[PDB]
Ligand binder design. Structure first.
Ligand SMILES: Nc1ncnc2c1ncn2[C@@H]1O[C@H](COP(=O)(O)OP(=O)(O)O)[C@@H](O)[C@H]1O
Ligand code: BEF
Lengths: 10, 445, 65, 473, 78
């Protein structure tokens, strides 16, 4: 479950 | 954290007060059971001999493998001052406290005890019908007044005063109501044994001028008493203490003789399930529990829809979770309650998924989750929604005559840990309101 | 070196637009702009803006009934 | 609710506290909970007799939600109307309900079942030579039907166009109508000799669905709901094969017309001679005594502009009295003019086949009197674990829009707002990365996009084929 | 760490103990052993509140369970 990671893109 | 909590409180007590505390055999016996198993072994060896043993000898008993446990045991005993290290003749001799040694000796050998364990009136009462009902209801009432559910008979001022000033159930006059806090939910989560000590430990700190040892003396021997028996009446401070004890549902009085209850015995570290509920993908809760206390605690973060005699059925909703989050309950705590109050069926299906997961690929062994991961993700995501905006109060600095001055002022703020944000291009930095004076003070200096 | 009372608001680029848009209609909301992810706002308006932001953000979140 | 002390937490339940009743010692075995007021049913799927009541409950109570462990069902008037049709009386329901309910069936629930379970079975609608007769087995009904302000052994005619009105009137009045076809004793209508070839296999869930439709031996009119890919095509084929009469299939697409015919030819033994497809390409109609017509609702629902080529087909369809009609994707039949095909086309039995039986408007319930009640519904999870349908790892990816685009988002109007956030750069990265990752894994990827402009933009840059309304067949 | 069960198998018999007294200069040494056992069992009970105690006496003509007593009183202790 990936809720604590950073965002996606760039 | 039961033995840690009781032990830690004892350590903070001054040694001068501890010596008087060990006067009664009853409290010494209770304190003896709190030390680690290795500490008890050494204490039992030293109680029955009126001699001096060098320190190294006790070390010889411990095997090489268990050497680590020796350090913890000796440290715990020394902190309580039960063990007195005496150095003479070039050797560090070890001896036991004379008061503690005598206190333990009397209890084991049945010596003069000065009625520390109490007396028997031979006037017993039915434990199941009266003692269990009275304490259960009295402890039930205080819990309901803490979880916020309406209840007719509010608790007395004594316990009410203790709850407020403590971290439990923060109250505000302007709001005119009482609500649970982050520690309050943890207090509910903690088992009955730890639940009782938290209130008692807070009360011990609340009392002022009532002697600290006397209150500790009464509490320890209370557990020594056996439920369903009479006990005639004690110190003057212990009298008002005994009446206050009734407020917490630990002792029952008709109006000369006091009867301990199940909670009283449980105090001294005594050794489908009710409350189990089903959490599924549809955010529907089916708690197989029949008790107002369980229902009340569930409603803190569950939108109840109906109730049957056998169980209560409800639904998790965004509104319900936000309500608990606003009060101060953390999401990690909520999942802990869900996990620790799971239905046996959920574990089996989760294990079946694990078994199939191992069958396909046994190289991965992740910690099994009783309830579906989707509920965990949504609950935590809602917590992130409430933490969407983060704001700090303080002041801003700008228009620095020289870059060196800006760096010097900013560097000091970082050193004292009061610098929040800074930008070199704008030569600006924001500091917390708490450390605003410190930064300003350094600016003058 | 003037202590301009304000709330140090840290926000993601998406939220940053909301505060700018909120400040557009209500000029008094935002005192000054710090950076892309940082802002300084009127301390009094902090209570109002937070509730106001929730109402706007509440719309894009569905409610079962 | 007599002499029950409310609990301190009863306030949290706003009139929903159903603890007034008591529980029998046999609660460990009875797998049904019943709400005395709302009619809700909570079913345990991990207790004995779960499979015993899994089929009985579905017949009487429609499912609101069937998650992993705790199944939720609700009893409604429409649901009971479906149950009472298949040889069910109040006495049987009450006896079984008490035998399975942990909590006693309240008088309110008892009253509800009594009212709606007694009306069924006193009025029948028959069709003869394209003439609709509202036949009743008793003469007492004439004083109730002929005197109705809407209408206009005893049998009286009724207008074909008025069928859509009288059927609603039947629901409003005490007696609702049932459409039962006695194909065994029907000799006037020419028969079609077709049987499933030996290579065919009938799956158990389909077998249950067919049984619910042929329970009493007379073909019923209703709806069969099965999950996508369950094999509804074979269910229709089996129904057509067993009836052995003139049949027709309606589908709301052009490519699907070939699919149904292709499945029809391979599964059953119908010769190509008796099958005719009525689409925009070819309109020839079979001249043999009996056959099949696999058309689309657009061709049959048109009323204003029909050309000579299609007009002859329309006369052929209307003149003859058909026996069966199959409505694939029946979740669009109650539309304004798609529902006209049901009345215009004469048939003694009507079958609905839709994976999803829901729609945005409140016209979904209208299917009861357009085509009949709901016969059988198959749980998606049960078929998935049985290997009949695939498992899906549904995921929702959150793609935060970039600051520059979001700046125009606030100002832009709603109409153009859709186009603004549909082509946000972040979604392009997610779609491209996901497509490449699954392409490496060796997965056949389908990308859906309602917005045509966005669909073109994705394909032109990514150099992948795209399909949209303007493309030819 | 965990409760422990202590089962004391005391072999009491006048023939065994009488010879001990005759060879030595101690009369009624069984009391000293019996007194020590009482304190020893109490010491074991003091280690933890959840531990149990069992005593079995092997007398001349058989064995008997001293504690716990069978379901089938003088004052000797305060
Ligand atoms: N009993 C069966 N035997 C063989 N194939 C079947 C069976 N039931 C379904 N299928 C297959 O399932 C797929 C979907 O069938 P279809 O009738 O189009 O499903 P639906 O209309 O319910 O979406 C096809 O590949 C079809 O051949
Ligand atoms: F995909 Be099917 F036609 F329900």
């Amino acid at each position: 479950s990936t809720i604590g990671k950073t965002a996606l893109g760039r | 954290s039961l033995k840690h909590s009781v032990t830690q409180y004892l350590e903070e007590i001054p040694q001068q007060v501890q010596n008087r505390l060990y006067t009664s055999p009853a409290t010494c016996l209770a304190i003896y059971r709190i030390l680690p198993p290795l500490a008890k072994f050494f204490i039992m060896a030293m109680v029955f001999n009126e001699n001096e043993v060098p320190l190294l000898d006790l070390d010889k008993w411990v095997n090489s493998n268990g050497k680590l446990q020796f350090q913890n045991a000796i440290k715990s005993m020394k902190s309580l001052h039960l063990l007195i290290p005496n150095k003479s003749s070039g050797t560090l001799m070890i001896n036991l406290n004379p008061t503690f040694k005598i206190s333990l000796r009397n209890a084991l050998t049945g010596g003069e005890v000065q009625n520390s364990f109490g007396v028997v009136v031979e006037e017993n009462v039915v434990s199941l019908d009266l003692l269990d009902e009275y304490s259960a209801n009295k402890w039930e009432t205080i819990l309901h007044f803490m979880v916020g559910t309406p209840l007719a008979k509010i608790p007395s001022e004594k316990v009410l005063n203790l709850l407020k000033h403590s971290k439990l159930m923060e109250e505000v006059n302007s709001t005119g109501e009482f609500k649970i806090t982050n520690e309050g939910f943890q207090f509910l989560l903690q088992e009955i044994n730890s639940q009782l000590w938290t209130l008692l430990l807070q009360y011990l700190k609340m009392i002022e001028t009532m002697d600290l040892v006397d209150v500790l003396h009464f509490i320890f021997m209370l557990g020594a008493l056996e439920v369903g028996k009479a006990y005639k009446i004690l110190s003057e401070t212990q009298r008002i203490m005994l009446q206050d004890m009734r407020d917490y549902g630990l002792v029952f009085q008709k109006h000369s003789i006091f009867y301990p209850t199940k909670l009283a015995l449980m105090l001294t570290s005594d050794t489908i399930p009710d409350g189990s509920l089903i959490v599924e993908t549809n955010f529907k809760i089916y708690s197989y529990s029949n008790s107002p206390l369980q229902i009340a605690v569930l409603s803190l973060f569950v939108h109840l829809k109906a109730r049957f005699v056998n169980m209560v059925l409800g639904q998790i909703t965004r509104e319900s979770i936000r309500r608990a989050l606003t009060n101060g309950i953390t999401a990690d705590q909520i999942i802990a309650y869900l996990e620790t109050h799971a239905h046996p069926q959920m574990r089996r299906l989760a294990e079946e998924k694990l078994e199939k997961k191992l069958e396909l690929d046994p190289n991965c062994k992740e910690p099994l989750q009783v309830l579906p991961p989707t509920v965990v993700d949504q609950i935590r995501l809602w917590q992130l929604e409430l933490d969407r905006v983060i704001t700090y109060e303080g002041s801003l600095y700008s228009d620095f005559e020289t870059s060196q001055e800006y760096n010097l002022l900013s560097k000091y703020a970082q050193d004292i840990g009061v610098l929040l944000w800074k930008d070199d291009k704008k030569k600006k930095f924001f500091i917390s309101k708490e450390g605003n004076s410190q930064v300003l003070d350094f600016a003058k200096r | 070196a003037r202590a301009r009372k304000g709330a140090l608001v840290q926000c993601d680029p998406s939220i940053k637009a909301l505060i700018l848009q909120i400040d557009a209609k209500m000029s008094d909301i935002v005192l000054e702009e710090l950076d892309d992810t940082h802002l300084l706002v009127n301390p009094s308006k902090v209570e109002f803006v937070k509730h106001e932001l929730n109402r706007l953000l509440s719309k894009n979140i569905y409610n079962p009934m | 609710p007599a002499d029950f002390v409310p609990d301190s937490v009863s306030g949290m339940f706003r009139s929903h506290d159903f603890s007034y009743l008591r529980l029998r010692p046999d609660h460990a075995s009875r797998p049904l909970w019943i709400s005395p007021s709302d009619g809700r049913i909570i079913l345990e799927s991990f207790s004995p007799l779960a499979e015993q009541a899994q089929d009985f409950l579905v017949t009487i109570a429609e499912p609101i939600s069937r998650p992993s462990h705790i199944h939720e069902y609700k009893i409604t008037a429409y649901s009971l109307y479906a149950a009472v049709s298949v040889g069910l009386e109040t006495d049987d329901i009450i006896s079984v309900l008490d035998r399975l309910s942990k909590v006693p069936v309240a008088e309110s629930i008892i009253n509800f079942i009594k009212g709606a379970t007694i009306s069924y079975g006193k009025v029948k609608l028959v069709i003869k030579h394209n003439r609709y007769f509202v036949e009743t087995t008793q003469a007492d009904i004439l004083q109730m039907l002929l005197n109705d302000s809407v209408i206009g052994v005893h049998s009286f005619e009724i207008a074909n166009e008025s069928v859509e009105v009288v059927k609603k009137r039947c629901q409003e009045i005490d007696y609702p109508v049932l459409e039962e076809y006695d194909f065994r004793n029907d000799h006037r209508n020419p028969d079609l000799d077709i049987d499933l070839k030996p290579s065919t296999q009938i799956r158990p869930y389909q077998e249950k669905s067919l049984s619910k439709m042929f329970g009493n031996g007379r073909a019923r009119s209703g709806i069969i709901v099965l999950p996508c890919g369950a094999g509804k095509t074979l269910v229709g084929i089996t129904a057509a094969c067993t009836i052995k009469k003139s049949v027709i299939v309606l589908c709301t697409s052009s490519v699907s017309v070939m699919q149904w015919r292709q499945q029809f030819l391979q599964w059953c033994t119908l010769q190509p001679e008796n099958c005719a497809v009525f689409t925009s390409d070819n309109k020839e109609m079979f001249q043999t005594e009996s056959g099949l017509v696999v058309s689309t609702y657009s061709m049959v629902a048109n009323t204003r502009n029909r050309s000579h080529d299609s007009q002859k087909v329309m006369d052929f369809l209307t003149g003859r009295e058909w026996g069966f009609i199959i409505l694939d994707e029946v979740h669009v039949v109650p539309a304004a003019m798609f529902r006209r095909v049901v009345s215009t086309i004469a048939a003694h039995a009507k079958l609905g086949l839709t994976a999803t039986l829901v729609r945005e408007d409140d016209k979904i319930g209208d299917l009861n009197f357009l085509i009949g009640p709901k016969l059988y519904e198959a749980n998606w999870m049960e078929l998935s674990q049985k290997g009949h349908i695939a498992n899906v790892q549904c995921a929702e990816v959150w793609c935060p829009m970039t600051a520059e685009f979001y700046q125009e988002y606030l100002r832009e109007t709603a109409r153009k707002r859709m186009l603004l956030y549909i082509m946000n750069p972040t979604k392009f990265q997610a779609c491209q990365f996901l497509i490449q990752y699954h392409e490496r894994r060796g997965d056949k990827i389908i990308v859906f996009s309602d917005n045509v402009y966005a669909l073109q933009e994705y394909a032109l840059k990514m150099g992948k084929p795209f399909i949209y309304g303007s493309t030819p067949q | 760490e965990s409760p422990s069960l202590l089962t004391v198998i005391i072999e009491i018999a006048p023939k065994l103990w009488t010879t001990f007294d005759e060879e030595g200069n101690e009369k009624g040494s069984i009391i000293k052993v019996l007194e020590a056992l009482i304190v020893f069992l109490n010491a074991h009970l003091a280690f933890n509140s959840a531990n149990k105690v069992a005593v079995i006496a092997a007398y001349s003509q058989g064995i008997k369970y001293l504690y716990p007593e069978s379901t089938s009183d003088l004052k000797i202790i305060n």
